[PDB]
Write a protein that binds this ligand. Sequence first.
Ligand code: BCL
Ligand code: BCL
Ligand code: BCL
Ligand code: BCL
Ligand SMILES: CC[C@H]1c2cc3[nH]c4c(c3C)C(=O)[C@H](C(=O)OC)c4c3nc(cc4[nH]c(cc(n2)[C@@H]1C)c(C(C)=O)c4C)[C@@H](C)[C@@H]3CCC(=O)OC/C=C(\C)CCC[C@H](C)CCC[C@H](C)CCCC(C)C
Ligand SMILES: CC[C@H]1c2cc3[nH]c4c(c3C)C(=O)[C@H](C(=O)OC)c4c3nc(cc4[nH]c(cc(n2)[C@@H]1C)c(C(C)=O)c4C)[C@@H](C)[C@@H]3CCC(=O)OC/C=C(\C)CCC[C@H](C)CCC[C@H](C)CCCC(C)C
Ligand SMILES: CC(C)=CCC/C(C)=C/CC/C(C)=C\CC/C(C)=C\CC/C(C)=C/CC/C(C)=C/CC/C(C)=C/CC/C(C)=C/CC1=C(C)C(=O)c2ccccc2C1=O
Ligand SMILES: COC1=C(OC)C(=O)C(C/C=C(\C)CC/C=C(\C)CC/C=C(\C)CC/C=C(\C)CC/C=C(\C)CC/C=C(\C)CC/C=C(\C)CCC=C(C)C)=C(C)C1=O
Ligand SMILES: COC(C)(C)C/C=C/C(C)=C/C=C/C(C)=C/C=C/C(C)=C/C=C\C=C(C)\C=C\C=C(C)\C=C\C=C(C)\C=C\CC(C)(C)OC
Ligand code: HEM
Ligand code: HEM
Ligand SMILES: [Fe+3]
Ligand SMILES: [Sr+2]
Ligand SMILES: [Sr+2]
Ligand SMILES: [Sr+2]
Ligand SMILES: [Sr+2]
Ligand SMILES: [Sr+2]
Ligand SMILES: [Sr+2]
Lengths: 280, 60, 60, 60, 258, 317, 318, 40
Amino acid sequence: AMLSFEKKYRVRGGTLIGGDLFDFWVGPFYVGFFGVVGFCFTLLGVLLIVWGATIGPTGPTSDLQTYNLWRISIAPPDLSYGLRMAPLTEGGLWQIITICAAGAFISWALREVEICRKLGIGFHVPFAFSFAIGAYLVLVFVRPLLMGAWGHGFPYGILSHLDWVSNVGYQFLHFHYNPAHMLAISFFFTNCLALSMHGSLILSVTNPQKGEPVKTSEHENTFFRDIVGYSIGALAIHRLGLFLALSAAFWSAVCILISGPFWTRGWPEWWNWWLELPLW
Amino acid sequence: FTMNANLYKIWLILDPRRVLVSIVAFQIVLGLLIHMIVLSTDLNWLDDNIPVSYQALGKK
Amino acid sequence: FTMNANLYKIWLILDPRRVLVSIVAFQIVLGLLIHMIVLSTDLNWLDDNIPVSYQALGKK
Amino acid sequence: FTMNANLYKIWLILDPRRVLVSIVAFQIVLGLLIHMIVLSTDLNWLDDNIPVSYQALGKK
Amino acid sequence: SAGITHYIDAAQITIWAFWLFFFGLIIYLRREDKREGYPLDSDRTERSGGRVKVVGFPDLPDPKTFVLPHNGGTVVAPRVEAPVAVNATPFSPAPGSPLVPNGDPMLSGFGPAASPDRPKHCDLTFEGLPKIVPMRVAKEFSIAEGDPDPRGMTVVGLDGEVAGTVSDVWVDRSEPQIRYLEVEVAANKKKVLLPIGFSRFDKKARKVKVDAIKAAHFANVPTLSNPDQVTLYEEDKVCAYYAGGKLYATAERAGPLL
Amino acid sequence: SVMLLGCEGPPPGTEQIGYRGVGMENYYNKRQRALSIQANQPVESLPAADSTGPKASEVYQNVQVLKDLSVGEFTRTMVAVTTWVSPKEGCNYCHVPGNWASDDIYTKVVSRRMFELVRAANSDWKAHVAETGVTCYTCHRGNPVPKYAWVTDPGPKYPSGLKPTGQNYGSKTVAYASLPFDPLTPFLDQANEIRITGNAALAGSNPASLKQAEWTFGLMMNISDSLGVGCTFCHNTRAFNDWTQSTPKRTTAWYAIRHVRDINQNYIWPLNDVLPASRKGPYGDPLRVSCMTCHQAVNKPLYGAQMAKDYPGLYKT
Amino acid sequence: PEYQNIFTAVQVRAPAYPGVPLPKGNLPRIGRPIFSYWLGKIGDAQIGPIYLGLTGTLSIFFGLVAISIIGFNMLASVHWDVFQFLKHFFWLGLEPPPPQYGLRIPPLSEGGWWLMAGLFLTLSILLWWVRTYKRAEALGMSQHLSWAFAAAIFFYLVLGFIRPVMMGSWAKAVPFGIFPHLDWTAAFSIRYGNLYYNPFHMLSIAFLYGSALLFAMHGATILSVSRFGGDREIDQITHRGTAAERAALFWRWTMGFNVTMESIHRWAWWCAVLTVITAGIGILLSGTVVDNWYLWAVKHGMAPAYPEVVTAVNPYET
Amino acid sequence: TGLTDDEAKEFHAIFMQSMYAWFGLVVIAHLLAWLYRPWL
Ligand code: BCL
Ligand code: BCL
Ligand code: BCL
Ligand code: BCL
Ligand SMILES: CC[C@H]1c2cc3[nH]c4c(c3C)C(=O)[C@H](C(=O)OC)c4c3nc(cc4[nH]c(cc(n2)[C@@H]1C)c(C(C)=O)c4C)[C@@H](C)[C@@H]3CCC(=O)OC/C=C(\C)CCC[C@H](C)CCC[C@H](C)CCCC(C)C
Ligand SMILES: CC[C@H]1c2cc3[nH]c4c(c3C)C(=O)[C@H](C(=O)OC)c4c3nc(cc4[nH]c(cc(n2)[C@@H]1C)c(C(C)=O)c4C)[C@@H](C)[C@@H]3CCC(=O)OC/C=C(\C)CCC[C@H](C)CCC[C@H](C)CCCC(C)C
Ligand SMILES: CC(C)=CCC/C(C)=C/CC/C(C)=C\CC/C(C)=C\CC/C(C)=C/CC/C(C)=C/CC/C(C)=C/CC/C(C)=C/CC1=C(C)C(=O)c2ccccc2C1=O
Ligand SMILES: COC1=C(OC)C(=O)C(C/C=C(\C)CC/C=C(\C)CC/C=C(\C)CC/C=C(\C)CC/C=C(\C)CC/C=C(\C)CC/C=C(\C)CCC=C(C)C)=C(C)C1=O
Ligand SMILES: COC(C)(C)C/C=C/C(C)=C/C=C/C(C)=C/C=C/C(C)=C/C=C\C=C(C)\C=C\C=C(C)\C=C\C=C(C)\C=C\CC(C)(C)OC
Ligand code: HEM
Ligand code: HEM
Ligand SMILES: [Fe+3]
Ligand SMILES: [Sr+2]
Ligand SMILES: [Sr+2]
Ligand SMILES: [Sr+2]
Ligand SMILES: [Sr+2]
Ligand SMILES: [Sr+2]
Ligand SMILES: [Sr+2]
């Protein structure tokens, strides 16, 4: 099924790969060659997370085995295995599910790409998506590699991965002092601010007080100029928000990339370079 | 004087208003900068109790 | 006076208003700065309780 | 030296409203700051325990 | 007995309240989501002659009216929109198959070249003067000190060939900026709009590249019913044409790569 | 710049601490690990002494601690205490020349007390000191004054009008963090409460303040830094208070904390009247002990070198 | 190749805009505009004018007072050494009244500046609130911002005033300092048994992540349909264009459903307000209702169990 | 600076007098400070 204005755009071609082979739609989703690779990667990934849930860390009958959603968890192999493939039931499974996750996100990104080629729009979205794909890769590929073992990756479990974050965070004592962490956190917070401001605006002008007509560009600029003496303007606000969120993802990726591989000490200690300048 | 030759032509290349404003800024910064450096090392001239102690001139 | 004659010409190169307001800015800043500096040192005139111990004429 | 035979001309160069508001702000600020500084040193005039005890006895 | 630990704490029930408010929120947002494009297009609808208008869950929200300022109109959502034929034919008769554009792809007005029928009126300033107008109509505007003046650059298409030259610059009277480049076309000296989004500058050369279409295609740029202003209808019409070239302007953008 | 800044290269040395996926792991600089090892080299022992002879308390005049030693063994014990505590100065550091039995010089009233300090340590604190035990070098390192001794410090200046933040400053003593900069006096001298975690999910029976939590956090930063490790060395940060999820090092550290309370309270504060101003902080409190004092940034002083077992004169009875 | 609409490559100027006109009662506007070729490189180059009423003046006033107490206090903690102030600034801070005082108004030297700075800050934030509602009325617009600011104000109030009053202790509000307030955050999680297991803090985290997800997606979209003037979202909302069409379709073909130029702004709006609102609820139950979230998670069976491969004997139990 | 050749001599002269006067008050203040409490 299609939107009431969709058929007129549902053109043939634009692929990267597959050509007419998989050049079709299913419901509202576009398939494409990468939808197929993606679905395959995805399906095997999920079906394996289901098998991991099925078997548990000590076998299907042990008490640690579980199907409870908060607690099902698939973890990496020990560090003793380094960059080698580890036995299936010892984190191998986790490795394969990871390969599937990376492949699925990359297929998804490439399929959004074929969709830009079809619709004839800019490719800003899948490029932006690729930042999340990047962050995910540092958290499973880059860091654990630079760290000589795949086990440095986070486990795939709703709260257990939260625990990973917690103890990794705490090896540096007071993570808040990670300066890249400070950045990324600043962007994540500001991004959340501009978004609330844009959101609020569009909705405040296209739906004004009863007795008033859809508002104008002139209003838009005049309100935020009224409040804070400046208005970045309509186009650009869409530009900024994209900057903030992509950067927030960036600095998360770098703040974790340096926590290990390039810094081992507590993070507050990093700030020493500042108390020791020859100014004080 | 000069550097030699024709160091006037330099102002056909570099904005005189900007070189002036920039230098004024820089000299002001370097000044506070160094003052702050020397006071921060052994060469301090304020916290010495020289030539007469001041906080235990308000003690006895 | 040890200066130029063509020294007024500087006001054909640099906007006078800015320089005037600026001097005040910089001087006020320096003034506050140095004041706080002295106050942080041996030359302090406030933290000692003299000539009538206002913090221990009816306290302590 | 006191005053120029032409230091009125400063208001041909500087806006009376901005200079006025500026002065007001700076002085009000300075009043506050200095008050805070005095309030943070010996010369405190509030917690002296003089001229008559207001916390009768002890606790408070 | 002073220890009967209750299994229910405020934290459970606050998580309960939250999820309930959540579900209602999600549902609601999906309703504002069907103020356009709905009901959907299936052959479920056509087979049944229409007795299956496709709307899904949740359903469609009662229309809302937008009261345009300036004797402009009134818009409603969701609305009933007149169907419009597709200027293309099914690549396969099976459903979900894409369609091939009819005729010359850039002309088709199908695919990356498709576009809707927006009003044949102009967007307006607050005052009510044509928001987008040329610098020739908007006297005040001026290049920003230190920016090559586009006026007089050479517009050049995707293959290299000169396309035309910048005859003017259209600007937003509401949010001051370059929206459209005007192009005196070489092959016929007719004046066409070129969206800024399709234009790249080469300031050191004073060229204005355009990957969209070929120099030649500039001949078919959709036209304006008045050279001193433009309507909403005409903007979509202008841009979609260039956009078509992204998939059409060459016998290779069609993809594959392998 | 806005320089950039503070940085090590990859790959770091790593050790897995907890279960795979739990994140309880450790990272470290290999280079600096090697430098710490060369700086944490132990002094080899002096040949055992045969002896075979009378007890020290029978041939000497003022032997109140190293009594039960044979003469030979006593002499050996004297040579180890000499190189270990004050080798640039030799024998004369703690003795009045020509008179080995005299206590007419303070460094001896102290040395004596420290003979009871090491002994109590090696014989009573094994749940802490295990079979590595301690010796003079542990704190002294060829120095008369442990380099890494501490003092209750007053922090930076405050005018008279306001009282100190108690926390909020740049201090290497709380790992550079801003927590409170003297988490030692209330925990490694006195015995204030460290526990703040509740043992019940719901509230109404845990009075721990947030402030107390910060003090515990500061102290912990201290500890971490002194032994040169992170919390996953002793904890499972999902539960700092959970003993079953902790590492056997938390147990060890627990007994160590009590131990430093005993060194500081019954061996060091008492020596304050016979010690010179040169050995005292701004409150008149004397230089005392912390974990750093001994560990000097390593999980086991001198990488767990076994020095004491070679000097029997260092054990009680 | 194709312009990305990241950097305005060629700008244009026009006489500045004093703005749509306000009704009687809404005071004059002040300041007269300027342009920054560089803001201009990326956005509206116009800088100001600004509006300042009774509200705006009372808010700037309170706010700057509050900024002074915090600052002056920080200079005092380093002995008026502006150098040292500069050196440790990040670590400087103004701590809260001690518990010994409870909710009593404390002496200057023991926390009273914090209560005054907290007081004045709050009054100034809430005055800025009123400001945005006035500035939003003068334009006939709606209070969507004010409903969000009111939400963020909600979190603020929960953090430094509401939870403290409920807990009967000013020492529980957050201290003013960069590193000090970071430490307050960590200690907060620690004191209540790891905040990761607090459901509300998990939701607030899903919503913060979501503000980044939605704004990145939408923002990337609007740029990708910038070519069709999709940035001109108002008219794409009244009079749907091929920008809003290609936009809704990119996502439709990608994730199976989609929204509209008007509705995405609601998903985004609602997602941001939600962050702060789960967030505040999250701090509200800590100490008031739950004292140890990890335990709470165990009581509701949500905390995972791992084989106990490392363990330590409890001295308190010997 | 859109100034004429004469309105920078006038300006410059007045600037010079006001500024040296400033330095004068400055030396006054500095000698009073030196008398009440020598610092060098
Ligand atoms: C534990 C205590 C330490 C700490 C330890 C850490 C550690 C350790 C880390 C962070 C990380 C981050 N922390 Mg932290 N952090 C601390 C406290 C905080 C605080 C706060 C108020 O106190 C905040 C705001 C943050 C916030 C942040 C961000 C700066 C960052 C996470 C964003 C990210 O990863 O993007 C990345 C986004 C992604 C990777 C998602 C990618 C999406 C992929 C491609 C697709 C997913 C598809 C999937 C299938 C979707 C499901 C859909 C189904 C199909 C339906 N932390 C505490 C003090 N923090 C993490 C980080 O840096 O990021 C790398 C990190 O490693
Ligand atoms: C640390 C050891 C000594 C010390 C050794 C030195 C040394 C050595 C030097 C100083 C210098 C100076 N010291 Mg010292 N100084 C000491 C203690 C102090 C104390 C104090 C509280 O005790 C103070 C307040 C000062 C302060 C001063 C300043 C008066 C002066 C720096 C001027 C500058 O930076 O360049 C500002 C730049 C200019 C004025 C350039 C003039 C610009 C021209 C006119 C540009 C033309 C354009 C237009 C006409 C005007 C430009 C715009 C201007 C903004 C007006 N010193 C300590 C005790 N000090 C410097 C000096 O020279 O002093 C004579 C210097 O070299
Ligand atoms: C330290 C380790 C703890 C931690 C402890 C906390 C605590 C404690 C809190 C958070 C809070 C939150 N945490 Mg956390 N957090 C952890 C790790 C993380 C991680 C991660 C990847 O690990 C993430 C993503 C997060 C994410 C977040 C955000 C989702 C959330 C707050 C949103 C926000 O900005 O509110 C901030 C926005 C505001 C406060 C409103 C701002 C508006 C005000 C009024 C602005 C006024 C401006 C002012 C007047 C301007 C003048 C300046 C003056 C000088 C002051 N945390 C770990 C588990 N986290 C909140 C929470 O969850 O509580 C349940 C919170 O308070
Ligand atoms: C450190 C130990 C001594 C000390 C020793 C000194 C010494 C030594 C000096 C001062 C000086 C200053 N001291 Mg003191 N001072 C002490 C204690 C104090 C205390 C106090 C609460 O106890 C106070 C309030 C002051 C206050 C002052 C300032 C009034 C003055 C510097 C003026 C300035 O910065 O302007 C900066 C200047 C300007 C901004 C421009 C000057 C005005 C121009 C010429 C006007 C032109 C018109 C203009 C265009 C428009 C004007 C409007 C502007 C908005 C202003 N001192 C302690 C006790 N003090 C200085 C002084 O006396 O004057 C030289 C000085 O040299
Ligand atoms: C980079 C800046 C921000 C961003 C941007 C971003 N994300 C994006 C996009 C963009 C622009 C898309 O266009 C794309 C999308 O489709 O939009 C929703 C996407 C996306 N954002 C999503 C996730 C996501 N993005 C996140 C964050 C971010 N993305 C940043 C905030 C986050 C977090 C952690 O906050 C998440 C969870 C997806 C819904 C979607 C991409 C969906 C997709 O790629 O699907 C294909 C894959 C599957 C359907 C699953 C594969 C099967 C696997 C083998 C099993 C899962 C393995 C997994 C590793 C286990 C982890 C378990 C966890 C419980 C720990
Ligand atoms: C969805 C929740 C998000 C959110 C929303 C949000 N924030 C908001 C709003 C909203 C809806 C507003 O309406 C309001 C705003 O104005 O938006 C731009 C605001 C706000 N967001 C801001 C901060 C903020 N919000 C944050 C977080 C968040 N807010 C969440 C991400 C954060 C964080 C945690 O990172 C911060 C730091 C502020 C800019 C603003 C509230 C401003 C305010 O309350 O002002 C109080 C007082 C002052 C600023 C004092 C004035 C000081 C002047 C700046 C100096 C000017 C002096 C001048 C020279 C005059 C002369 C002086 C004389 C006295 C001498
Ligand atoms: C055996 C075998 C064959 C298996 C059977 C297969 C099975 C199981 C069949 C089931 C099929 C069904 C039920 C579903 C398929 C599941 C698929 C493949 C997975 C879904 C993956 C997917 C990405 C889901 C994510 C869901 C969420 C919430 C994503 C977050 C994004 C977000 C918050 C969503 C809502 C907001 C959206 C969509 C905004 C997009 C959007 C934006 C951003 C604009 O800016 C814009 C501007 C102008 C007009 C329109 C838009 C617009 O639509
Ligand atoms: C109708 O639309 C609307 C408007 O138009 C009328 C408005 O005007 C408005 C009003 C909006 C405003 C007035 C906007 C105000 C902006 C705010 C509050 C955001 C605050 C941001 C800052 C203060 C800037 C912080 C950042 C910096 C100072 C620069 C930092 C530089 C750094 C970190 C180094 C650069 C390098 C990196 C970051 C690494 C690499 C970067 C990436 C990978 C990111 C990629 C980005 C892109 C864009 C492709 C609204 C709400 C609106 O909706
Ligand atoms: C030298 O410097 C000069 C310019 C003088 C000034 C410089 C000033 C500077 C640089 C100041 C810097 C300040 C900084 C960096 C501050 C940082 C603050 C941060 C990061 C704070 C973070 C969190 C703080 C919070 C959440 C505080 C919350 C406090 C609240 C909500 C207090 C509420 C109190 C109220 C409402 C009081 C009520 C009083 C009543 C009426 C109840 O009394 C009876
Ligand atoms: C090689 C150098 C040294 C020699 C030859 C030496 C020799 C002796 C002798 C012979 C005695 C017994 C004296 C008596 O009580 O009659 C003695 C006692 C003692 N010496 Fe040493 N000594 C040396 C170095 C040191 C050093 C360096 C210290 C302290 C760091 C020290 C601390 C003591 C103490 C405290 C006593 C009293 C012992 C007790 O009560 O058990 N000696 N020394
Ligand atoms: C920097 C991160 C660290 C944090 C946040 C931290 C936090 C804590 C907290 C909160 C407690 C109290 C739990 C309760 O309230 O019942 C605690 C207790 C304890 N921690 Fe730490 N810790 C850290 C590092 C360390 C390290 C490295 C060690 C050992 C070398 C250690 C050893 C201990 C011991 C033995 C206890 C129990 C002490 C007692 O109960 O008297 N901690 N820690
Ligand atoms: Fe938008
Ligand atoms: Sr089972
Ligand atoms: Sr130094
Ligand atoms: Sr004095
Ligand atoms: Sr007094
Ligand atoms: Sr009273
Ligand atoms: Sr480490």
